[PDB]
Design a protein around this ligand. Structure first.
Ligand SMILES: O=C1NC(c2cccc([N+](=O)[O-])c2)=CCN1c1ccccc1O
Ligand SMILES: [Ca+2]
Lengths: 233, 88, 153, 478, 77
């Protein structure tokens, strides 16, 4: 379940407007659930508004161990009522074993990130090299592992907001005790199911995050006018 | 003298009032003549009676997807319009 | 002025053809068609009131009986040698025409003139001093002497 | 409310009771509290159990709560079962509102109000959002209406239908407070329809003119432009987008950025259609038909025909009118039969509302007098019947000629003034009232002082009415 | 359309110069380029850099009043 306040609604409307302007790929999960729902909504809206000038590219990367209705073909399929989204113009699904395997696609995804981050295309203004920005707005184990896999890689350019769950705990403090203090105050009902053997792992994750603070930036609450997504990226 | 010159003054007042509404009323009336000259598959008026016999020929023998697409178009400027109002 | 003349010409043609048709019968002379249909309803705009409608003020010494001399045709007569036309159809006709043109249509022209004078006045001084450029450029261009003497120059 | 919520939340048993907390924060107007600590953890949203709280937020006027419920996820058309609509119109529908609806259906009946009378008769015994929108719009709810209106598909059609309903209910004379509320809400939705369509048009022309013509699979059973006509919403049609649409349909195939004298000059010289003097933007026989199909030239041809008809009428009636019809009367009767066929075509394709316009009434009446003049005319060898035939045709000529004023209302210059001309009737009647009172008083007083016991009625009325009437053109009684 | 239907002296001149460059006062030509495109903020930046500033403003006003008469695309008008 996803909290869609009108500010984040405005932000991701602006984000897909920027991606239509610059001609960007957007990588995301690609399920029907939560934020990917709304991203597919705005992709469909900016498609149906102008119907020309570089129809944008959205790749959803799914795990195939969570897709409910699975059809093997060569012959188009018909996916109908994790559930995939109706509006992602490309879907990529990683292959693994059983159903009880979340977070499988992260390795292929981050390897594709690193490969474009080293891939050279000299028709640009970045000195070639195809700039890559990561956004984190939500929370979970996936987000923290994604941000550290980014910042450990070259060209992460990680951006967070000033509202969310883990966007609040990285947005606020920009050692172990202060990480604990912010993590128990911005996640009051998710610490209750956690052994400390991986809470200390998370403290190591965040200490690896804040190692490279120049590769990280934030959106604030006073910075709330127009074109703040452009200013951040 | 008195009653004719009072009529002149009341005409002058009414012309003064109805004038800024008058162009609106004229271009509102324009709809009806466009709908009476754009409806019928209409030939020359003198010859029209002959085409009327073509209708005698009739009595001699006798969900859509782009719609939903243009409604979906309307919704986007609705959203932009609401953003403008709330910006005011 | 043109809206006035349009409405007045429509009323004038309608009344003139109706009166010439009710009174007389088969006029063949074109000048006396147009003196009766166009010219006399035109004179009603300055308050003239057409004369031949009453039948109690109608004398036969201003007729022809056949278009042979200058005068109009007579109104078409009866077998009793009386005029055929109903006064109860021609007296109210002249009254409606006379009300409609001498009073309503002239006083509407007054009101439309008043409205146009009211609008164009704040622009009017600008338009006059814009027109002033052209006369200054036609009197300051030529190395110009007296007009009578100008031919010598 | 905050004290009650602090008590209810810290009982350590109903911390899990999100429903009781939500209903407590709903019965009060605690919006910010319900936003900040119910829908924030993203821990438990089932999105289907929100139905009872939705029905209560509807029937108790909590529009910010239904906004929050839609923003967190609830489909109306899944929710809005016919049992919901019969509960809304049967139980939650006011009884003064229904009496005003009866009075407006009996005294100011209309097409759209007949439609909404039938649907409110349905639910007190499939486009659901439009019915809920009518429910909220009739109750004068004014803020639930906006929340549902932002969720609709046919947004401009919705705003125009609502504006028409509320302008009709603002005429009901009892309860002028409710009339004032419905008038203000009518103005608000018609402003909303205008301002949305001008943004749709200022981005794009082709898709806005795609919007204008659809019927929404029987909204009220009509169209966006038709609904703006029926409410006399003449600010929606006076706006430049619809006027651009109309003028593009009026010139037809000819581009509008050509001068008009070129069009009428190509009209009079018929085989000059095939030359580069008229621009046909919006192989040679296509230029021919593209000229002679457009509304502009079939209208202009029709007025040339009509002027030639009036000249033939006048020639026949004044210079050539005998005991048997000569050839120009027979051609005249043919042209009048053509006009008769056009009027019966227009009546067969309008029905009853054809007789609503006064021009069509006097139009049919003029055809009646023409055929009566024919049947008086054919009794030859009888001078009275033949003279009576000519008199009937002369008065009919008055009617046919004054129709020319109505014809020229389409002009860009004469047109608005001819439309202005009918706003003068109350001035003319006030003038004629005062003049008739003075005329009767003076005429009876003068006829009484001068003469004694006139017995002839014609000479009563020539003296009492006719001569004081002639004093209005400056005659001065003799 | 504006050269065929509403022709003028200045529009004949700008038709000839736009016919030149699609096949010496440079800032005025760049100013015409920006002024025709309805660019509206590059025009001000170049206008503040010109010599004949009043002449520039009057020529631009005349061009745009002529192009505002073209009947198709009333948004651009
Ligand atoms: O179609 C038409 N029918 C009649 C008509 C037909 C029969 C009787 C009468 N009448 O008595 O006024 C009028 C009026 C003129 N008319 C017309 C001609 C040219 C352009 C527009 C038009 O509406
Ligand atoms: Ca008619």
């Amino acid at each position: 379940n996803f909290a869609l306040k009108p500010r984040m609604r405005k932000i991701f409307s602006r984000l897909i407007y920027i991606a239509q302007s610059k001609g960007a790929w957007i990588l995301t999960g690609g399920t029907h659930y939560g934020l990917m729902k709304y991203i597919g909504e705005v992709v469909r809206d900016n498609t149906i508004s102008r119907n020309s000038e570089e129809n944008i590219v959205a790749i959803g990367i799914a795990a195939w161990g969570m897709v409910s209705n699975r059809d093997t073909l060569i012959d188009e399929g018909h996916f109908s009522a994790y559930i995939l989204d109706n509006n992602h113009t490309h879907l990529l699904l990683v292959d693994n074993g059983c159903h009880g395997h979340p977070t499988v696609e992260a390795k292929l995804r981050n390897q594709l990130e690193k490969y474009i981050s080293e891939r050279t295309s000299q028709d640009s203004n970045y000195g070639g090299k195809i700039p890559i920005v990561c956004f984190a707005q939500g929370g979970g184990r996936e987000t923290l592992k994604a941000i550290n896999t980014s910042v450990k890689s070259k060209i992460p350019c990680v951006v967070v907001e000033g509202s969310g769950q883990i966007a609040d705990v990285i947005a606020s403090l920009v050692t172990s005790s202060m990480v604990k203090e912010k993590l128990v105050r911005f996640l009051p009902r998710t610490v209750s199911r956690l052994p400390e053997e991986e809470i200390e792992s998370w403290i190591k994750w965040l200490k690896e995050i804040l190692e490279s603070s120049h590769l990280l930036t934030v959106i604030k609450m006073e910075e709330a006018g127009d074109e703040i997504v452009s200013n951040a990226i | 003298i008195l009653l004719v010159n009072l009529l002149v003054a009341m005409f002058g007042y009414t012309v003064g009032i109805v004038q800024e509404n008058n162009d609106q009323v004229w271009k509102f009336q324009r709809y009806f003549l466009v709908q009476e000259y754009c409806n019928r598959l209409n030939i020359p008026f003198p010859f029209v009676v002959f085409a009327y016999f073509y209708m005698v020929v009739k009595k001699c023998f006798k969900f859509r997807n782009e719609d939903n697409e243009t409604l979906a178009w309307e919704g986007v400027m609705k959203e932009n319009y609401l953003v403008k109002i709330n910006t005011k | 002025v043109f809206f006035f003349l349009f409405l007045f010409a429509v009323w004038m043609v309608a009344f003139g053809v109706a009166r010439q048709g009710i009174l007389r019968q088969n006029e063949q002379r074109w000048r006396w068609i147009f003196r009766s249909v166009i010219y006399e309803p035109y004179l009603a705009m300055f308050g003239q009131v057409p004369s031949d409608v009453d039948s109690t003020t109608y004398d036969f010494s201003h007729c022809t009986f056949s278009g042979n001399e200058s005068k109009p045709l007579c109104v078409e007569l009866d077998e009793h040698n009386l005029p055929r036309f109903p006064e109860w159809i021609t007296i109210p006709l002249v009254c409606i025409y006379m009300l409609s043109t001498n009073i309503l249509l002239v006083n509407l022209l007054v009101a439309m003139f008043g409205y146009t004078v009211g609008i164009v006045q704040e622009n009017n001084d600008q338009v006059w001093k814009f027109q002033r450029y052209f006369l200054v450029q036609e009197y300051c261009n030529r190395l110009n002497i007296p007009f009578p003497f100008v031919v010598f120059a | 409310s905050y004290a009650l919520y602090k008590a209810f939340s810290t009982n350590e048993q109903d911390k899990d009771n999100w429903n009781g907390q939500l209903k407590l924060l709903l019965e009060w107007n605690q919006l910010d509290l319900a936003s900040d600590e119910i829908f924030t953890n993203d821990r438990r949203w089932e999105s289907a159990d929100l139905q009872e709280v939705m029905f209560t937020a509807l029937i108790k006027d909590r529009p910010k709560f239904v906004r929050l419920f839609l923003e967190n996820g609830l489909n109306l058309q899944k929710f809005l079962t016919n049992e919901v609509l019969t509960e809304l119109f049967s139980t939650h529908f006011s009884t003064l509102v229904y009496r005003n609806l009866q009075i407006a259906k009996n005294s100011y009946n209309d097409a759209l109000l007949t439609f909404v009378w039938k649907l409110v008769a349905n639910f007190r015994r499939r486009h659901p959002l439009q019915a809920l929108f009518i429910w909220a719009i009739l109750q004068n709810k004014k803020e639930l209406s906006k929340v549902i209106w932002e969720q609709t598909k046919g947004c401009t059609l919705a705003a125009l239908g609502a504006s028409k309903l509320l302008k009709t209910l603002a005429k009901v004379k009892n309860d002028i407070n409710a009339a004032g509320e419905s008038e203000e809400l009518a103005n608000e939705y018609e402003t909303r329809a205008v301002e949305l369509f001008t943004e749709c048009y200022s981005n794009d022309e082709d898709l806005a003119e795609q919007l204008l013509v659809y019927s929404c699979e029987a909204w009220g059973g009509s169209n966006c432009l038709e609904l703006a006509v029926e409410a006399t919403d003449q600010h929606f049609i006076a706006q430049p987008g619809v006027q651009n649409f109309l003028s593009k349909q009026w010139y037809g195939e000819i581009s509008r950025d050509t001068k008009n004298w070129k069009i009428i000059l190509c009209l009079f010289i018929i085989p000059l259609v095939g030359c580069g003097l008229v621009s046909f933007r919006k192989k040679l026989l296509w230029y021919y038909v593209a000229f002679f199909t457009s509304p502009f030239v079939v209208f202009s041809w029709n007025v040339v025909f009509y002027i030639a008809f009036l000249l033939l009428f006048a020639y026949v009636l004044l210079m050539d009118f005998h005991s048997v019809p000569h050839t120009p009367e027979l051609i005249l009767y043919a042209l009048v039969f053509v006009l008769f066929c056009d009027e019966v075509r227009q009546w067969y394709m309008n029905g009853v509302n054809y007789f609503t316009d006064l021009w069509n009434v006097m139009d049919t009446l003029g055809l009646f007098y023409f055929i009566a003049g024919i049947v008086f005319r054919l009794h030859s060898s009888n001078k009275s019947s033949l003279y009576s035939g000519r008199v009937i045709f002369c008065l009919d000529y008055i009617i046919f000629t004054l129709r020319l004023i109505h014809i020229f209302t389409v002009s860009r210059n004469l047109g608005p003034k001819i439309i202005m001309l009918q706003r003068m009737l109350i001035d003319v009647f006030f003038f004629l009232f005062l003049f008739a009172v003075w005329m009767v008083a003076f005429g009876v007083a003068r006829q009484g002082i001068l003469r004694q016991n006139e017995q002839r009625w014609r000479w009563i009325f020539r003296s009492v009415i006719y001569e004081p009437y002639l004093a209005m053109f400056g005659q001065v009684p003799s």
